[PDB]
Write an enzyme that holds these catalytic residues in place. Structure first.
Site, PDB file in Angstrom:
ATOM      1  N   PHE A 115       0.308  -1.370   0.072  1.00  0.00           N
ATOM      2  CA  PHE A 115       0.365  -0.458  -0.244  1.00  0.00           C
ATOM      3  C   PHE A 115       1.033   1.420   0.043  1.00  0.00           C
ATOM      4  O   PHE A 115       1.688   1.438   1.389  1.00  0.00           O
ATOM      5  CB  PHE A 115      -0.992   0.348   1.402  1.00  0.00           C
ATOM      6  CG  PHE A 115      -1.309   1.083   1.413  1.00  0.00           C
ATOM      7  CD1 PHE A 115      -2.497   0.936   0.186  1.00  0.00           C
ATOM      8  CD2 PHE A 115      -1.594   1.778   2.398  1.00  0.00           C
ATOM      9  CE1 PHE A 115      -3.719   2.752   0.846  1.00  0.00           C
ATOM     10  CE2 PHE A 115      -2.762   2.954   2.577  1.00  0.00           C
ATOM     11  CZ  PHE A 115      -3.119   3.486   1.616  1.00  0.00           C
TER      12      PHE A 115
ATOM     13  N   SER B 283      -3.422  -6.273   0.926  1.00  0.00           N
ATOM     14  CA  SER B 283      -3.118  -5.290   0.269  1.00  0.00           C
ATOM     15  C   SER B 283      -3.124  -5.180  -1.297  1.00  0.00           C
ATOM     16  O   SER B 283      -3.334  -6.159  -1.547  1.00  0.00           O
ATOM     17  CB  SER B 283      -2.887  -3.725   0.439  1.00  0.00           C
ATOM     18  OG  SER B 283      -3.820  -2.585   0.181  1.00  0.00           O
TER      19      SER B 283
ATOM     20  N   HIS C  73      -7.756  -0.866   6.696  1.00  0.00           N
ATOM     21  CA  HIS C  73      -7.469  -1.221   5.845  1.00  0.00           C
ATOM     22  C   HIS C  73      -6.183  -1.743   6.689  1.00  0.00           C
ATOM     23  O   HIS C  73      -5.177  -2.308   6.296  1.00  0.00           O
ATOM     24  CB  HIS C  73      -6.838  -0.312   4.833  1.00  0.00           C
ATOM     25  CG  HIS C  73      -6.344  -0.998   3.758  1.00  0.00           C
ATOM     26  ND1 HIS C  73      -6.536  -1.826   2.584  1.00  0.00           N
ATOM     27  CD2 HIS C  73      -4.801  -0.604   2.934  1.00  0.00           C
ATOM     28  CE1 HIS C  73      -5.662  -2.429   1.805  1.00  0.00           C
ATOM     29  NE2 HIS C  73      -5.081  -1.305   2.108  1.00  0.00           N
TER      30      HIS C  73
ATOM     31  N   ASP D 236     -12.879  -0.666   5.510  1.00  0.00           N
ATOM     32  CA  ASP D 236     -11.789  -0.789   5.026  1.00  0.00           C
ATOM     33  C   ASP D 236     -12.266   0.267   3.899  1.00  0.00           C
ATOM     34  O   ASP D 236     -13.409  -0.114   3.281  1.00  0.00           O
ATOM     35  CB  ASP D 236     -11.523  -1.729   4.319  1.00  0.00           C
ATOM     36  CG  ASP D 236     -10.371  -1.892   4.081  1.00  0.00           C
ATOM     37  OD1 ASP D 236      -9.901  -1.199   3.374  1.00  0.00           O
ATOM     38  OD2 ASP D 236      -9.209  -3.207   3.105  1.00  0.00           O
TER      39      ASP D 236
END
Ligand code: NA
Length: 262
Positions: free
Chosen positions: A60, A133, A211, A179
């Site tokens: 991410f 992610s 997240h 998220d």
């Protein structure tokens, strides 16, 4: 029992403790050698025999923190666990799958490297991946390729369920209820729903999670521990002592296909 089994007969309290039965050390991996960017290998001390090995990958941009918790935590139950650094030359899920494969290849090679602290410690046939992610999309991609024996996508993100639908490995998805980066309804939930019937599978949505909620090191460690460590024990070590944890106020949704066939 299993030839691969390690440690004491488990309990919830044992799983939820900060560390399992083994003491742990770490060793840095250079980006110049690795093919995957840098990383850190966590491994137990005072053991013998080969053990399963796990790659833990982030994914991410502008992440405020990463997946480091999983390294010492999981290694302390009896795995060689390599975390991948946050800033690397990899980005979207296709590249993350390559990154994961390069990291797996690297770990396999370490088993026979004379000068490696993990020489002789790795069962090169018992490999798992935990990925966050875009790294979670990468994890599903690699799970479909048939080498890894366990997959744990954390708040996965991808553009398609194509790879989820082809997973060849037991897959546990951690979803994060709240998220906003990889919303559950667009990513983790449809990915789980696409997984084949022919694998052991589970979906654990963590109540209130951002997240970051699968990454460890915050207020969700109990659920991550119970499901995640048990997933690797059952699936990499064939350790049926851990079925009991797999087959609650922190869990806002659950799916699975218990009972898992031994
Ligand atoms: Na919510």
């Amino acid at each position: 029992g299993s030839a691969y089994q390690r440690g004491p007969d488990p309990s919830v309290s044992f799983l939820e403790a900060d560390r399992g039965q083994y003491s742990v050390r770490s060793s840095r991996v250079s980006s110049l050698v690795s093919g995957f960017g840098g990383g850190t290998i966590y491994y137990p001390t005072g053991t013998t025999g080969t053990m399963g090995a796990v790659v833990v990958i982030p994914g991410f941009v502008s992440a405020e923190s990463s997946i480091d918790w999983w390294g010492p935590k999981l290694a302390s139950y009896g795995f060689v666990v390599m975390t991948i650094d946050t800033n690397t030359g990899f980005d979207q899920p296709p590249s993350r799958a390559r990154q994961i494969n390069n990291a797996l290849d690297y770990l396999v090679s370490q088993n026979s490297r004379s000068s490696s602290p993990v020489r002789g410690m790795i069962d090169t046939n018992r490999l798992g991946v935990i990925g966050w992610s875009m790294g979670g999309g990468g994890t599903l991609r690699v799970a479909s390729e048939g080498r890894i024996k366990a997959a744990i996508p954390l708040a996965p993100w991808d553009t398609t369920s194509y790879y989820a639908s082809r997973s060849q490995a037991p897959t546990l998805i951690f979803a994060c209820e709240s998220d906003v980066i990889a919303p559950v309804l667009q990513h983790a939930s449809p990915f789980y729903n696409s997984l084949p019937s022919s694998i052991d599978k589970a979906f654990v949505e963590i109540n209130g999670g951002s997240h970051y909620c699968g990454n460890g090191g915050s207020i969700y460690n109990d659920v991550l521990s119970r499901f995640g460590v048990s997933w690797m024990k059952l699936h990499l070590d064939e350790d049926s002592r851990y079925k009991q944890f797999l087959c609650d106020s922190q869990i806002s949704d659950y799916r699975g296909n218990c009972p898992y066939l031994e």
